[PDB]
Amino acid sequence: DEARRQIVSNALISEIAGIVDFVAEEQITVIEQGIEKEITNPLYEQSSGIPYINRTTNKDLNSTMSTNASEFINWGAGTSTRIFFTRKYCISTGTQGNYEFSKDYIPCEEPAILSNSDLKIDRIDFVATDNTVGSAIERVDFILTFDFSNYVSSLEKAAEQHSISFKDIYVVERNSSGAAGWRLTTISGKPLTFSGLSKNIGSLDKTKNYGLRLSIDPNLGKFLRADGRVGADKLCWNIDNKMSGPCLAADDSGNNLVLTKGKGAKSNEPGLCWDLNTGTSKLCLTQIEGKDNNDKDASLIKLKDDNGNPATMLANILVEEKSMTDSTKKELRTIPNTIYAAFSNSNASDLVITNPGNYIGNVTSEKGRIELNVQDCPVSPDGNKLHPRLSASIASIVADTKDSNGKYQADFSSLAGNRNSGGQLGYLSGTAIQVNQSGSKWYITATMGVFDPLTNTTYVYLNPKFLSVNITTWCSTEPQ
Amino acid sequence: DEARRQIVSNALISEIAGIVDFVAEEQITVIEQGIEKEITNPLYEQSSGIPYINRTTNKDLNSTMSTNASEFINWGAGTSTRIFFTRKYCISTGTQGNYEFSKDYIPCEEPAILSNSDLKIDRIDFVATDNTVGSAIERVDFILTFDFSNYVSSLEKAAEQHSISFKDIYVVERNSSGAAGWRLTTISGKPLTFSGLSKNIGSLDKTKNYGLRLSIDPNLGKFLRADGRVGADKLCWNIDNKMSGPCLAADDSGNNLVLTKGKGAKSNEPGLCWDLNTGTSKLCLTQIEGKDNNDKDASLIKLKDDNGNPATMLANILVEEKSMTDSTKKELRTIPNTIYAAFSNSNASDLVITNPGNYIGNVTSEKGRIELNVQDCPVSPDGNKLHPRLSASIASIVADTKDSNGKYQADFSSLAGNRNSGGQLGYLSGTAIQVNQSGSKWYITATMGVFDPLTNTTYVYLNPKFLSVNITTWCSTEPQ
């Protein structure tokens, strides 16, 4: 069953991956007296003790594996090794380890799947690059005891998923069950690598106890990697085979990437550009020189094509400014919309309000009204509730009266033709324009006073086709 | 003093780093009669002379160091060597060197500290990769004469701070004070590395003149480097272990990075995205197809979530367009704000202007006025002074008169209740609305004419509560 093998290999590679992470940190983030502190990894202090200083020297993958217990590191059951690679306070009391890492490299308790599995990490070798105490480790070999190509496929899959790869896989053997008895399995004096285990499986006696030695190369080499595990101090782009293009580097915050000019730029105007490569100009977001409201030196961003003409961005925009009434307070608003509209009462029955002093209206159901759906306000920063807003301004207004047939002729329903219907005008008293809202609708209503000097009769009109307004809608922190 | 040793090492590494940087440039930017031009490094012209063609042949770090003066390069006092690695016009008249580099690899005048320090660069070896004239150099060795573990610590610190690392450090000796007498210090026929000077210090006689040979490798090509000293032609990202993601490359300008679609994209809509990983959609700035005002093919940018809906950007926006009056001139504007407000004179004492023909207002101090703080305008590109603007449009107006109690009933202070007090209206003459400013304030005032037909009395009102306006505020290059 390979589904069980896959769990064992995922745990094994999880353990292997954590250990490599620990080796690959020369400075580790530790927790001394409640405040994170960076200290040198105990691996590279020539003052730390067993097992942090333990080193083997078989730099060659084909050299004889060590038989010294203070050179390799015995792992697993019966060993207190795990204490030295887990937090001091994996128990509430504190273990015998002296370090509280800011992060768990491996779980404090070994994965339960590995407690009785057929493949276990039995011993870990730290290959030293030189002969100084606390030297750098240039290869980590993991001896996994078998309690053979099925697991290698499974382990290779699990390592593929964890962004690690084996330098090589060797078959290792020992005559007993001691951690220092491990030697390389040999075919004619040549150590048997796993890739060559297909042809040499027959010349191996069942009298030995076998396992695999997985060799990794911890050092996260100074070069940027496909797995992205290299932090870049900066990165610059080439132009015509020279390092004269823009550069990206992080600022101190950890949140921001900063784009700066290259050495080849004759002008200092860095930009990010999008290109469809479909025959039109790329669009660039470029930083350019400016001046503030007090004529001091400043800068801004411009979205432009390759001709220097502004480009178009589709988005919701919020603008923040101090309230022009009370300063020291911020106000947010969106880009407004304008709709031209006139009211729609046309005949005398709907137009004339019979008893003005007594009339009590219902702007939700009055004839001739303007009705709109309440817009949805866009995203706003935390703690700034945006309210939908609406207002109306007078666009055209006349005091039209009944003609010889009791009909009203002045009509402003279409802006391109307001003067083409003239009407028979009286004296204007003015108009009262009101804006109300329910949960879903904006309601706009109006009242106009007119004196007819022909009949000396006073009329009050409701939502007339003689009055048209320009309606402005937006969202704002300033309520309605 | 490790403080004095550190300055010597910083100078030493500065020289070393500059020299190595020059070695690492096969094409160099030179200046020929006013203009920068690319020419082949004289090191790799089989037509250049001493010392550009000088090459040693000890490829092995353990091989015999050359003893031929036309193979190694003597450095320092008594040598004209430095001329050939600095600009021709480090002096105003011109030196015997033949090249004006566009940049100083090493300072023209040697760091003054190196003129008399205990450690000096005595000789520089250019290890050739083959036996052709002007061949590539595969290692640069700096022989430093002592005029031994203290300075190695300092030099390694200085090389760490200057983004270089030593391939290896050897101990060298000479029987006298010639630059060609340098040979490798040996213990039992084995060249003495510095990592083995701890155990063999006693078997070294003080009758020799000793020094260190620092070996630096030349290029850091092909692979991008963590310290960012390697430029990228482009960079593309992986998806599912394939190079199918977007690509960034510099355009010709030196200012722009250009984002383009990946090979795995089924649509051509490249985007830059932000993600908080806090449960909401990432926000993307994506380039999409569009059409201009002549319906010709074009493009724009869209700020959208993963659902294709517009997202919100909080920023100040400037829009540029040609003046709708005088073409050939460009004008800037900001996103406006709208304020609904009514004037506030309510009682007859404040409302009525007794002798209108004689009245001279003081719009700064008149009762009932609308007063606002002059807004601050945002940043604009150089040479485009923005002026604050304010305008008013009529929202509601009626020709109210005194009621039976001498009070004025119509009130438009609240848009949602403009019709709630009808008042007793006369005939309207109109209104004059004025906007003025001091250094800090907008002053909005108004005058309304009303004829009362009940009393045949002519009225002029100042800043009445029955007149309301929509105040629009913005910034523009078009003045007030």
Binding site: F451 | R419, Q424, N456
Partner: peptide, 11 residues
């Protein structure tokens, strides 16, 4: 909600 008219005068 509510909307109302207004009284006007006669000579």
């Amino acid at each position: 909600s509510e909307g109302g008219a207004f009284t006007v005068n006669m000579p």
